[PDB]
Design a binder for this molecule. Structure first.
Ligand SMILES: CCCCCCCCCCCCCCCCCC(=O)OC[C@H](CO[C@@H]1O[C@H](CO[C@H]2O[C@H](CO)[C@H](O)[C@H](O)[C@H]2O)[C@H](O)[C@H](O)[C@H]1O)OC(=O)CCCCCCCCCCCCCCCCC
Ligand code: CLA
Ligand code: CLA
Ligand code: CLA
Ligand code: CLA
Ligand code: CLA
Ligand SMILES: CC(C)=CCC/C(C)=C/CC/C(C)=C/CC/C(C)=C/CC/C(C)=C/CC/C(C)=C/CC/C(C)=C/CC/C(C)=C/CC/C(C)=C/CC1=CC(=O)C(C)=C(C)C1=O
Ligand SMILES: CCCCCCCCCCCCCCCC(=O)OC[C@H](COP(=O)(O)OC[C@@H](O)CO)OC(=O)CCCCCCCCCCCCCCC
Ligand SMILES: CCCCCCCCCCCCCCCC(=O)OC[C@H](COP(=O)(O)OC[C@@H](O)CO)OC(=O)CCCCCCCCCCCCCCC
Ligand SMILES: CC1=C(/C=C/C(C)=C/C=C/C(C)=C/C=C/C=C(C)/C=C/C=C(C)/C=C/C2=C(C)CCCC2(C)C)C(C)(C)CCC1
Ligand SMILES: CC1=C(/C=C/C(C)=C/C=C/C(C)=C/C=C/C=C(C)/C=C/C=C(C)/C=C/C2=C(C)CCCC2(C)C)C(C)(C)CCC1
Ligand code: OEX
Ligand SMILES: [Ca+2]
Ligand SMILES: [Ca+2]
Ligand SMILES: [Cl-]
Ligand SMILES: [Fe+2]
Ligand SMILES: [Mg+2]
Lengths: 167, 34, 81, 34, 65, 37, 342, 29, 504, 39, 30, 38
């Protein structure tokens, strides 16, 4: 039913072509990226506290005062992976970024749904490209449009008596 | 409904076998000396 | 720091801007002329607005043969009279 | 006091030079009429 | 550790742990063979892909009969 | 026989048990529909 | 030992603004070419001859609709090398045949290889464990499954995603209508891993930021941290109690927490990659057979599943003629599936 | 069209001009 | 203690118990091969190689036995459809039994090596510590592999001392096991040329022998020994895993595209043969040759072998299946019984109409008929109210040539429509849907399942490779980084060369 | 015989060898000119 | 039988929630 | 030559305004000529 809602939404608002949904996608893809990234760097710089025959997780004790990884080494790595100033040396700034990116992005996803709720819809570049005579030159937007058309005409096949789906 | 008649055993063993593996490991962990 | 000159030093210096008030506009203008002269179309083989279809044609010039694809494209272009 | 032509300089210009060229191209493109 | 007849027989074959040739040794020859192997793989790949088309080499079910 | 010195004890703590059972049960809830088809 | 190899090694591994390394020799040209190829194509290059599409700023497309599009279906899985038998060294014709697509895909792939190797190399030099590269295996599994394996299982590169915003959206809607890809449990695990990863990211960031120790007098709390400080900047104990009382469970082990933060999105993406591998062969989760048998016998039997299949059928019939121009589809008005009125 | 770009040119520059003038004169920024 | 996911690391410094574990694994795999062969023999119907071959029956190991020359059963039948053949011991049953016995012997050997793990052989004579000289083991094993490969190519595949391999015509109509001579020219690298497989095994065999001798006789360079951590078995694990995912992607590819080692009579046709209407083209060629020589249409189509017509049917396209659509292809469309014949559609004016075929992409597809120039002449409308091309309006009829319906014509719109619906799948067949309670939904073939499983496993083994390479190269820090790590080793510019303390 | 596509293959091979060759030549040269200070 | 299976698995998951919350290994400061 | 002569806030303000101008042009171009749908 979730998928139904999504497909119909695409048909009726062309949500994929809406910048708030794109920000949503940046939000969750980005959220996952930074989650995996952060996970990987912190895991990468754990201080040796264990032997090879035991889990490294036992190297950390709940409530200990000392940090369990070396952030300076982590930053040293990631700063060389890209370049120094593209890396966080401040754990607080880093975690704030970690909080903010997915939260803000997902806020935009939500506002996307909530404004398409009032039919301010995705970008419409249907027949935006025209040749010198006036022939329509399709772009990927128009193929999207054809898919959207399939969705529009098929959904709720018995619910419509009149030609326009106005809500 | 005309479901796959092996779906039941497939699901049941899918749950039970690794769950049992984990319970074996946990329980034999608990019984080790403190 | 890694030994290179700080960016803020460079981009707040007079010499940088002496160089780049020349080099940047020159590049921008070169790109501009790359399009406005129509050279881009020729280099990349992109249709001009008057070159997508022959006058009465409504069929896409789709490539349908792998190894004679070059010739196919040339024929499509020839048919634009 | 500081070198000018470094690896960093090269990296920067491999991106920046074409970027400005392309932006000029696209800017020119905004005035094309069918 | 336990000695056995066959263990005694095979002993020399597992007695040189850690033994190395000095410096770079045969690394360059190896490198040559790697380059040649890369080229070989490139050849058979481009043949299969029909980017490399050779006389008498019809890459098809209809290769012969 | 003389004992093998490479032997190590194995452990699964309770949190790991719970995590594993969650993984397995949720995977089963997901795939079961497809197994029944 | 101080031969040329070691001297080269010395220079390559110099601590500079942009680290190079042995991995740089693979990474930088391939990445540069992939990105440059994308920008070049999206700016100047058409898809008229391959797709019957405009795809460049030059043609009037915008950032959302520009793409470097896949080759014509008739190209099959040709490497489409500039010097290959298709383009025969002609760069213009090469562009017109979709050569930039394979150009970008392949330089992209070797570039990703270069980047992961870079992660290993730097991890080794700095003396950290190589979990960043391991985590990076997931993006690679996705790229390889989707841009390479998938079209390789299909008729041609044509059905791979085209490198473009709208084109990628088209790829999504194609997968819904043709593969019913949402119904696929590997995709579902992908979704769970992505959204779960974003959840973990957000919740962890917020938890740290809201259990900070007061280490300064400032009301803006970022300066009250020092990279070299030994102490935890936030309270694990308080965080743990908070979530235990709020949610019922809580992390108590930071190492576990962060490994879990690695595990979840990487595993998700990997599962999705497996599903796409299935789709390469059209080995879909399209249907529930029991559902179809019931619905076939009982025209009053309806679920959201059957509704979604109606949607899929619409997508296919309405989009196929323009989306797949090589098939020469002609679908008469009368065969097009439509409900009442619309 | 030329008039509109001229207007937004003067209006657009006004602010940075305020800031520039104050910075040059060691004003109370 | 050890986490659950590390239990097997106890074998790392225990060569004897590692050998025991490998023996057990091998025993499991061989036991699998035996039991799989037995289950397939317990389910395989050998009575119809034409329309019910192994690949229609969900047979997986059977085609591999067939591929290398095992084609008969002790019970007297052969997969080529012969009767009263004596396959000797090496029937499918004999192969299965051999694998079961092998499994048992490997189990016992595993027990012996597990108990008697502490052999002097596994001890470095200088340190008394457990040690394996992996470079030399590599030489020995590479040499053995070389010998086995060479022998496989030169004797088995050539038929010089062995059965040969499965070979067929380009349309998979007359396949059988034949000896194959090596192709030493460039066509040897043509995947569809079997002689290339033979020459491959002979040449690569010899090369393996030579390189093996080299690796026995020549020690690693110190620089490579150190760089690749050749004292650490996990490096061997890492590189072996890389080689294995490489090989797996290759066999997945050759299965999907087809090659001399993935014949259509054993694994089913490829999706691409449907895509390019390969069999339709051959069928049309043969019919045209028949008509040119004076045959009637009925005679021309009746001369088409049922097997060839059967290849020209989308139900055998391996890209029409489903991930959870389980079992043999027969469980879907049914057990094929007979070709109905070639359907020819005509309108009231008598023009031949052609049903537009379903592409593999489409789970469902409309029914559209065009004339020879692709102009639409008839269809099955969705909406009727403005229909202009209905079979009823266009008076569409269908006449059959060849097969069961040879000579028959149907004019009543329901029936003509029904056959057009079947015509979207290509040639039309009668199925037994009752025997297996077939549900009418397409399933993939062993080609598809093999391809899927191997692409997936290959991709996962990419991860295995990455992980063990990581563990190998970073062994020193995998319990964590140096607790005494100096901030200056990671602060920029302190060293001129990253990580090198001698460059302060 | 050398088909056009075999000639193409050779052209590609040469182009790759040239790119990699010039790259390694240049990097080696630079490495020799700009040595790290030790001791 | 399918429904029984689905509801069973769900119920097992909820019970698991119960044990994972109220009968977890307690976090201890060392 | 000397670093600091031209203040960074001016460099930032001018560069930023340049970016606004070029992007603005691209948006104008969305409504005129090719891609305008007209
Ligand atoms: C892990 C992560 C690591 C990072 C990855 C590193 C990236 C490196 C980049 C590698 C590039 C490989 C591109 C391969 C292109 C291809 O394959 O090109 C395809 C060719 C075969 O060509 C195709 O063959 C088909 C069938 O042909 C045959 O059948 C036809 C009809 O019967 C005709 O008879 C025809 O003449 C006959 O040849 C069609 O003709 C297609 O149009 C045609 O494209 O195979 C071939 O070159 C070679 C096939 C065998 C080797 C395959 C190894 C690699 C591929 C693994 C994936 C398998 C895909 C299965 C899906 C799961
Ligand atoms: C290391 C960086 C790198 C890498 C990995 C690649 C990789 C790739 N690029 Mg290249 N590319 C690069 C840098 C790189 N590029 C650069 C810097 C440029 C700018 C000049 C280009 C420009 C470029 C173009 C224009 C194109 C490619 C393409 C290709 C692909 C095919 C290459 C090939 O067939 O080589 C074959 C050659 C080798 C593998 C070298 C072999 C070396 C051996 C070991 C030595 C033997 C040679 C011997 C001395 C010669 C004797 C022969 C004699 C008998 C006649 C390939 C995916 C093509 C592509 O993408 O098409 C879709 C393509 O068209 N690239
Ligand atoms: C290379 C592996 C392989 C392949 C390609 C095949 C292929 C074939 N098998 Mg064989 N089979 C295999 C291994 C394989 N089998 C093994 C190891 C066994 C022993 C158990 C069997 C036992 C077997 C039997 C008994 C039979 C077959 C049959 C068949 C055929 C039907 C295939 C089918 O319906 O699959 C369906 C495939 C699926 C439904 C896909 C399963 C996907 C799993 C469930 C995914 C699991 C996800 C995982 C839990 C996620 C973890 C996430 C975590 C990491 C976070 C087919 C030709 C049948 C046939 O027709 O025989 C005549 C038949 O009766 N097979
Ligand atoms: C003792 C000898 C022996 C023999 C004669 C056979 C013979 C048979 N077995 Mg096998 N089998 C054996 C041992 C043997 N088996 C063992 C010990 C095992 C347990 C691992 C198995 C497990 C097994 C299985 C699981 C299966 C078979 C099957 C079969 C049959 C097809 C074989 C085939 O397709 O392989 C193909 C083999 C290859 C393609 C080998 C690839 C070699 C790689 C690429 C080597 C790479 C490393 C090398 C060092 C590289 C350097 C090379 C150098 C020369 C340059 C066949 C009847 C199949 C069958 O149909 O079952 C009923 C089947 O499914 N067997
Ligand atoms: C030749 C193949 C091979 C081999 C010999 C190893 C060997 C080893 N790996 Mg593994 N590994 C491999 C492939 C291989 N790996 C691959 C392909 C992957 C990617 C998926 C991994 C990923 C991996 C990881 C992530 C890790 C290892 C580790 C380990 C070591 C301990 C394994 C253990 O104790 O598990 C015990 C396993 C169990 C108690 C149950 C596992 C149940 C599985 C998940 C499901 C059922 C599997 C089924 C029975 C197998 C069917 C066969 C299949 C081929 C179709 C061990 C040295 C670990 C390590 O290095 O320790 C320090 C470790 O962390 N490996
Ligand atoms: C993302 C991909 C990736 C990554 C990150 C690694 C990383 C790792 N691998 Mg490698 N490996 C890979 C893919 C990858 N591998 C592949 C596909 C294979 C093929 C089987 C191997 C085979 C392999 C082996 C055999 C070994 C490793 C080892 C290792 C480790 C040491 C680094 C190394 O050897 O790099 C190797 C270098 C590369 C992967 C770069 C290759 C660049 C090629 C030559 C460019 C070719 C251009 C091409 C010719 C252009 C034409 C294209 C054509 C389509 C037209 C390390 C853990 C070693 C190890 O684990 O030591 C402990 C080891 O022994 N790997
Ligand atoms: C054949 C040829 C000739 C070979 C010659 C090779 C020769 C040697 C090359 C030398 C010259 C070379 C330099 C020329 C370059 C050519 C050209 C420029 C190549 C371009 C290639 C490529 C396309 C560039 C892409 C640009 C770049 C990679 C984009 C991605 C980077 C991205 C934008 C970073 C910003 C995002 C930022 C917010 C990330 C932080 C969030 C996340 C990581 C938090 C996690 C985290 C962070 C921490 O910070 C720490 C601490 C911890 C704990 C932690 O959890
Ligand atoms: C999008 C980027 C967002 C990150 C935030 C920007 C930092 C903002 C920051 O923190 O303050 C600005 C920062 C200040 O630097 P400085 O003025 O102090 O000078 C730096 C020197 O002192 C270093 O020796 O300069 C930057 O690094 C930005 C310029 C980017 C340089 C572009 C390099 C191009 C090469 C391509 C990189 C290759 C990566 C390798 C992997 C393939
Ligand atoms: C054919 C024969 C087949 C027989 C084989 C039997 C198969 C056995 C399979 C064993 C797997 C058990 C899983 C271990 C589970 C477990 O023990 O994890 C906890 C574990 C922690 O290990 P530690 O390093 O902390 O050491 C503690 C030790 O006690 C563990 O042994 O982490 C891992 O094992 C890595 C995998 C993480 C898995 C996390 C997934 C759970 C999250 C929830 C997912 C579902 C909900 C999602 C909602 C959207
Ligand atoms: C492919 C080719 C290759 C190479 C070439 C290349 C590599 C080039 C480069 C070039 C490139 C490299 C391009 C340039 C660029 C960029 C541009 C096109 C621009 C842009 C962007 C933008 C427009 C900005 C804006 C926005 C955002 C993004 C950010 C912030 C916000 C804003 C709004 C500002 C060769 C020749 C070898 C061969 C053949 C082919
Ligand atoms: C000892 C004794 C005896 C006997 C032995 C035997 C009785 C035999 C056997 C063998 C056997 C009878 C056992 C076995 C094998 C089996 C296995 C090893 C299999 C496995 C399974 C798998 C692994 C699969 C997985 C999964 C699932 C299940 C499904 C889907 C997915 C997959 C496929 C992944 C004799 C007389 C010889 C003598 C000597 C001694
Ligand atoms: O209800 Mn659920 O979806 Ca919103 O649009 Mn109108 O209504 Mn019905 O159609 Mn389309
Ligand atoms: Ca005009
Ligand atoms: Ca029935
Ligand atoms: Cl609906
Ligand atoms: Fe953190
Ligand atoms: Mg415009």
């Amino acid at each position: 039913g979730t998928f139904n809602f999504m497909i119909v939404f695409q048909a009726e608002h062309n949500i994929l072509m809406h910048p708030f949904h794109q920000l949503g996608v940046a939000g969750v893809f980005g959220g996952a990226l930074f989650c995996a990234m952060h996970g990987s760097l912190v895991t990468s710089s754990l201080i040796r506290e264990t032997t090879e025959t035991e889990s490294a997780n036992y190297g950390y004790k709940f409530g200990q005062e000392e940090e369990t990884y070396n952030i300076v080494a982590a930053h040293g790595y990631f700063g060389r992976l890209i370049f120094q100033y593209a890396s966080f040396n401040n754990s607080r700034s880093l975690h704030f970024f970690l909080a903010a990116w997915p939260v803000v992005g997902v806020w935009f996803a939500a506002l996307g749904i909530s404004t398409m709720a009032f039919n301010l819809n995705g970008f419409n570049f249907n027949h935006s490209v025209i040749d010198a005579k006036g022939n329509v030159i399709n772009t990927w937007a128009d193929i999207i449009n054809r898919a959207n058309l399939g969705m529009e005409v098929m959904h709720e096949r018995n619910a419509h008596n009149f030609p326009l789906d106005l809500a | 409904m005309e479901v796959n008649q092996l779906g039941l055993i497939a699901t049941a063993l899918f749950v039970l076998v690794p769950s049992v593996f984990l319970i074996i490991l946990y329980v034999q962990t608990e019984s080790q000396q403190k | 720091t890694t030994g290179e000159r700080p960016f803020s030093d460079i981009i707040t210096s007079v010499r940088y801007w002496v160089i780049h008030s020349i080099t940047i506009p020159a590049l921008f203008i070169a790109g501009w002329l790359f399009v406005s002269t129509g050279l881009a179309y020729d280099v990349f083989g992109t249709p001009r607005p008057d070159s997508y279809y022959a006058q009465e044609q409504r069929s896409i010039p789709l490539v349908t043969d792998r190894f004679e694809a070059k010739q196919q494209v040339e024929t499509f272009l020839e048919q634009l009279k | 006091s500081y070198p000018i032509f470094t690896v960093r300089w090269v990296a920067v210009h491999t991106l920046a030079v074409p970027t400005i060229f392309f932006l000029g191209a696209i800017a020119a493109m905004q005035f094309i009429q069918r | 550790a336990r000695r056995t007849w066959l263990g005694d027989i095979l002993r020399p074959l597992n007695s040189e742990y850690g033994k190395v040739a000095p410096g770079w040794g045969t690394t360059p020859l190896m490198a040559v063979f790697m380059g040649l192997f890369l080229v070989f793989l490139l050849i058979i790949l481009e043949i299969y892909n029909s980017t490399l088309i050779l006389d008498g080499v019809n890459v098809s079910w209809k290769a012969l009969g | 026989m003389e004992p093998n010195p490479n032997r190590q004890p194995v452990e699964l703590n309770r949190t790991s048990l719970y995590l594993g059972l969650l993984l397995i049960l949720v995977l089963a809830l997901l795939f079961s529909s497809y197994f029944f088809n | 030992e101080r031969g040329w190899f070691d001297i080269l090694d010395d220079w390559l591994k110099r601590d500079r603004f942009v680290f190079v390394g042995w991995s740089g020799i693979l990474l930088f040209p391939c990445a540069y070419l992939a990105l440059g190829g994308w920008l070049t194509g999206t700016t100047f290059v058409t898809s008229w001859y391959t797709h019957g599409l405009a795809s460049s700023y030059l043609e009037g497309c915008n950032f959302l609709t520009v793409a470097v599009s896949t080759p014509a279906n008739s190209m099959g899985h040709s490497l489409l090398l500039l010097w290959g038998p298709e383009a025969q060294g002609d760069f213009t014709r090469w562009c017109q045949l979709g050569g930039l697509w394979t150009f970008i895909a392949l330089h992209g792939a070797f570039g990703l290889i270069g980047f992961m190797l870079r992660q290993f190399e730097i991890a080794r030099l700095v003396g950290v464990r190589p979990y960043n590269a391991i985590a990076f295996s997931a993006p690679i599994a996705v790229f390889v499954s989707v841009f390479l394996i998938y079209p390789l299982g299909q008729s041609s590169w044509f059905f791979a995603p085209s490198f473009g915003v709208a084109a990628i959206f088209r790829f999504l809607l194609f997968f819904q209508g043709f593969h019913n890809w949402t119904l696929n449990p590997f995709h579902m695990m992908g979704v769970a891993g992505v959204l779960g990863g974003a959840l973990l990211c957000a919740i962890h960031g917020a938890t740290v930021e809201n259990t900070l120790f007061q280490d300064g007098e400032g009301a803006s709390t970022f300066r009250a941290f020092n990279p070299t400080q030994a102490e935890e900047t936030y309270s694990m104990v308080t965080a743990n109690r908070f979530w235990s009382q709020i949610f019922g469970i809580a992390f108590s082990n930071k190492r576990w927490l962060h490994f879990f933060m690695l595990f979840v999105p990487v595993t998700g993406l990997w599962m999705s990659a497996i599903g796409v591998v299935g789709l390469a062969l059209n080995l879909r989760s399209y249907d529930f057979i029991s559902q179809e048998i019931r619905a076939a016998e009982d025209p009053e039997f309806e679920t959201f599943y059957t509704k979604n299949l109606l949607l899929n059928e619409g997508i296919r019939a309405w989009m196929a003629p323009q989306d797949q121009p090589h098939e020469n589809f002609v679908f008469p008005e009368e065969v097009l599936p439509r409900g009442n009125a619309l | 069209v030329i008039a509109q770009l001229t207007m937004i040119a003067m209006i657009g520059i006004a602010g940075p001009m305020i800031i520039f003038l104050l910075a040059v004169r060691r004003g109370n920024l | 203690g050890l986490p659950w996911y590390r239990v097997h690391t106890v074998l790392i410094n225990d060569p004897g118990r590692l050998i025991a574990a490998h023996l057990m694994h091998t025993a499991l795999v061989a036991g699998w091969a035996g039991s799989m062969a037995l289950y397939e023999l317990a389910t395989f119907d050998p009575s119809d190689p034409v329309l019910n071959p192994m690949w229609r029956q969900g047979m997986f190991v059977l085609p591999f036995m067939a591929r290398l020359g095992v084609t008969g059963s002790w019970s007297g039948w052969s997969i080529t459809g012969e009767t009263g053949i004596d396959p000797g011991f090496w029937s499918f049953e004999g192969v299965a039994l051999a694998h079961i016995v092998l499994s048992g012997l490997l189990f016992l050997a595993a027990c012996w090596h597990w108990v008697y793990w502490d052999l002097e052989l596994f001890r470095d004579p200088r340190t008394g510590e457990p040690a394996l000289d992996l470079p030399k083991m590599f030489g020995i094993h590479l040499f053995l592999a070389g010998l086995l490969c060479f022998g496989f190519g030169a004797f088995h595949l050539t038929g010089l001392f062995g059965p040969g391999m499965w070979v067929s015509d380009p349309y998979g109509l007359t396949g059988s096991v034949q000896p194959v001579a090596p192709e030493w020219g460039p066509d040897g690298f043509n995947p569809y040329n079997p002689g290339g497989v033979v020459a491959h095994h002979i040449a690569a065999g010899i090369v393996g022998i030579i390189a093996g001798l080299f690796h026995i006789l020549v020690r690693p360079p110190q620089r490579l020994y150190k760089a690749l951590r050749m004292g650490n078995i996990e490096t061997v694990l890492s590189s072996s895993i890389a080689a294995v995912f490489f090989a797996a992607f290759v066999v997945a590819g050759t299965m999907w595209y087809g090659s001399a080692t993935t014949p259509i009579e054993l694994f089913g046709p490829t999706r691409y043969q449907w895509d390019s209407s390969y069999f339709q083209q051959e069928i049309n060629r043969r019919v045209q040759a028949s008509l040119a020589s004076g045959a009637t249409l009925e005679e021309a189509w009746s001369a088409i072998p049922e097997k060839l017509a059967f290849y020209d049917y989308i139900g055998n396209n391996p890209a029409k299946g489903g991930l959870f659509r389980t079992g043999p292809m027969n469980k879907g469309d049914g057990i094929a019984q007979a070709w109905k014949g070639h359907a020819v559609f005509r309108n009231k004016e008598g023009e031949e109409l052609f049903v537009r075929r379903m592409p593999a992409f489409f789970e469902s597809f409309p029914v559209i008929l065009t004339d020879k120039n692709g102009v639409v002449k008839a269809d099955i409308p969705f909406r009727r109210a403005e229909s202009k091309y209905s079979f009823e309006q266009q008076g569409v009829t269908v006449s059959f040539y060849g097969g069961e319906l040879n000579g028959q014509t149907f004019t009543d719109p329901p029936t003509v429509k029904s056959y057009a619906r079947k015509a979207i799948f290509g040639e039309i067949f009668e199925f037994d849907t009752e025997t297996l309670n077939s549900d009418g939904i397409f399933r993939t073939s062993p080609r598809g399942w093999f391809t899927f499983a191997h692409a997936v496993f290959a991709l996962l083994f990419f991860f295995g490779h990455i992980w063990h390479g990581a563990r190998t190269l970073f062994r020193d820090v995998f319990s964590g980084i140096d607790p005494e790590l100096s901030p200056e080793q990671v602060e920029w510019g302190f060293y001129q060369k990253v990580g090198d303390v001698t460059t302060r | 015989t050398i088909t056009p596509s075999l000639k193409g293959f050779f052209i590609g091979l040469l182009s790759g060898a040239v790119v990699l060759g010039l790259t390694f030549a240049v990097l080696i040269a630079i490495s020799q000119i700009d040595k790290v200070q030790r001791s | 039988m399918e429904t029984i299976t689905y509801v069973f698995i769900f119920a097992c998951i909820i019970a698991l929630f119960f044990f994972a919350i109220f009968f977890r290994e307690p976090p201890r400061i060392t | 030559s000397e670093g600091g002569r031209i203040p960074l806030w001016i460099v930032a303000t001018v560069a930023g305004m340049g970016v606004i101008v070029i992007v603005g042009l691209f948006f104008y171009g969305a409504y005129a000529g090719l891609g305008s749908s007209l």
